[PDB]
Design an enzyme around this catalytic site. Structure first.
Site, PDB file in Angstrom:
ATOM      1  N   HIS A 160       4.532  -1.407  43.557  1.00 23.38           N
ATOM      2  CA  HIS A 160       4.039  -2.183  44.701  1.00 23.38           C
ATOM      3  C   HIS A 160       5.171  -2.621  45.650  1.00 23.38           C
ATOM      4  CE1 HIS A 160       4.770  -6.027  42.396  1.00 23.38           C
ATOM      5  NE2 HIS A 160       4.964  -6.493  43.618  1.00 23.38           N
ATOM      6  N   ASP A 187       2.517   0.014  37.308  1.00 23.28           N
ATOM      7  CA  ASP A 187       3.293  -0.567  38.409  1.00 23.28           C
ATOM      8  C   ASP A 187       4.791  -0.404  38.169  1.00 23.28           C
ATOM      9  OD1 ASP A 187       3.933  -1.842  40.770  1.00 23.28           O
ATOM     10  OD2 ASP A 187       3.343  -3.849  40.093  1.00 23.28           O
ATOM     11  N   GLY A 234       8.220 -12.531  45.816  1.00 22.67           N
ATOM     12  CA  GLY A 234       9.627 -12.232  46.076  1.00 22.67           C
ATOM     13  C   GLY A 234      10.395 -11.855  44.821  1.00 22.67           C
ATOM     14  N   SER A 262       8.894  -9.899  42.632  1.00 23.34           N
ATOM     15  CA  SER A 262       8.331  -8.553  42.459  1.00 23.34           C
ATOM     16  C   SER A 262       9.375  -7.491  42.190  1.00 23.34           C
ATOM     17  CB  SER A 262       7.595  -8.137  43.733  1.00 23.34           C
ATOM     18  OG  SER A 262       6.373  -8.815  43.856  1.00 23.34           O
ATOM     19  N   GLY A 263       9.158  -6.701  41.142  1.00 17.10           N
ATOM     20  CA  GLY A 263      10.009  -5.552  40.849  1.00 17.10           C
ATOM     21  C   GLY A 263      11.232  -5.873  40.019  1.00 17.10           C
TER      22      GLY A 263
HETATM   23  C1  LIG Z   1       5.518 -11.300  42.245  1.00 19.21           C
HETATM   24  C2  LIG Z   1       4.526 -12.208  41.567  1.00 19.21           C
HETATM   25  C3  LIG Z   1       4.702 -12.629  40.261  1.00 19.21           C
HETATM   26  C4  LIG Z   1       3.608 -13.440  39.993  1.00 19.21           C
HETATM   27  C5  LIG Z   1       3.295 -14.166  38.705  1.00 19.21           C
HETATM   28  N1  LIG Z   1       3.190 -15.590  38.945  1.00 19.21           N
HETATM   29  C6  LIG Z   1       2.807 -13.436  41.251  1.00 19.21           C
HETATM   30  C7  LIG Z   1       1.514 -14.088  41.666  1.00 19.21           C
HETATM   31  O1  LIG Z   1       3.406 -12.664  42.211  1.00 19.21           O
END
Ligand SMILES: Cc1cc(CN)c(C)o1
Ligand SMILES: [Ca+2]
Length: 223
Positions: free
Chosen positions: A40, A84, A175, A177-178
């Site tokens: 993503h 993912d 933020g 993420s990944g």
């Molecule tokens: C990147 C990300 C991790 C998480 C887990 N609280 C969420 C909603 O968005």
């Protein structure tokens, strides 16, 4: 990261920032020319930033290297976030040192209760919005498959696990993420999704990296 701590500069040497004019995702360096991140996080025009602490200041240990290619997992479904995971190849090999270092892939999957380290430059608030400049860290346990599935009915696949705290307060967030989930020196997870951040009974959900080791190795060997 909500409810975490300031890691300390370059104390998480495999942590990368993906930059397309700005930080938009984390990643993990797995060898001198490859990064693992979330599917993503896919976009064009990615520059990989290694050796970062403060992502807004050049502090002297950074390496900035453009991606030559990205490979999203063939079975990635963006609706369900199943599979993912994505690989990013660097245009040139990073110079590895104490502050820029690869993280080992797992040889086996980690169990519920295993203590891990989650890190990133994501939002530090569960209601508001505040983005840190320096890398944040969170120590968090892997949760049982049963509690993960109970938290998110109908949504947890065999390629996902929950980590964190059912009481809330401590979690990954937008933020992050990944980015990495590292347990006993192995990359076991990738920051994938959740429902809000640090909310009660809504722990973070992570890509189960041990399921992808064969794919990662074979992909690297031919690309
Ligand atoms: C990147 C990300 C991790 C998480 C887990 N609280 C969420 C909603 O968005
Ligand atoms: Ca910097």
């Amino acid at each position: 990261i909500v409810g975490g701590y300031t890691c300390g500069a370059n104390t998480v040497p495999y942590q990368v920032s993906l930059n397309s004019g700005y930080h938009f995702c984390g990643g993990s360096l797995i060898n001198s020319q490859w990064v693992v991140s979330a599917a993503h996080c896919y976009k064009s025009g990615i520059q990989v930033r290694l050796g970062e602490d403060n992502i807004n200041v050049v502090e002297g240990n950074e390496q900035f290297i453009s991606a030559s290619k990205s490979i999203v997992h063939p079975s990635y479904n963006s609706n369900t976030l199943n599979n993912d995971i994505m690989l990013i190849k660097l245009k040139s090999a990073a110079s590895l040192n104490s502050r820029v270092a690869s993280i080992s892939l797992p040889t086996s999957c980690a169990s519920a209760g295993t203590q891990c380290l989650i890190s990133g430059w994501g939002n530090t608030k569960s209601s508001g919005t505040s983005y840190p400049d320096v890398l944040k860290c969170l120590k968090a346990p892997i949760l049982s498959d049963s509690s993960c599935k109970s938290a998110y009915p109908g949504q947890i696949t065999s390629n996902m696990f929950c980590a964190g705290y059912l009481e809330g307060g401590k979690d990954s967030c937008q933020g992050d993420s990944g980015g990495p989930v590292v347990c006993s020196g192995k990359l076991q997870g990738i920051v994938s999704w959740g429902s809000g951040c640090a909310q009660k009974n809504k722990p973070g959900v992570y890509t189960k990296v041990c399921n992808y080791v064969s794919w990662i190795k074979q992909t690297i060997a031919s690309n």
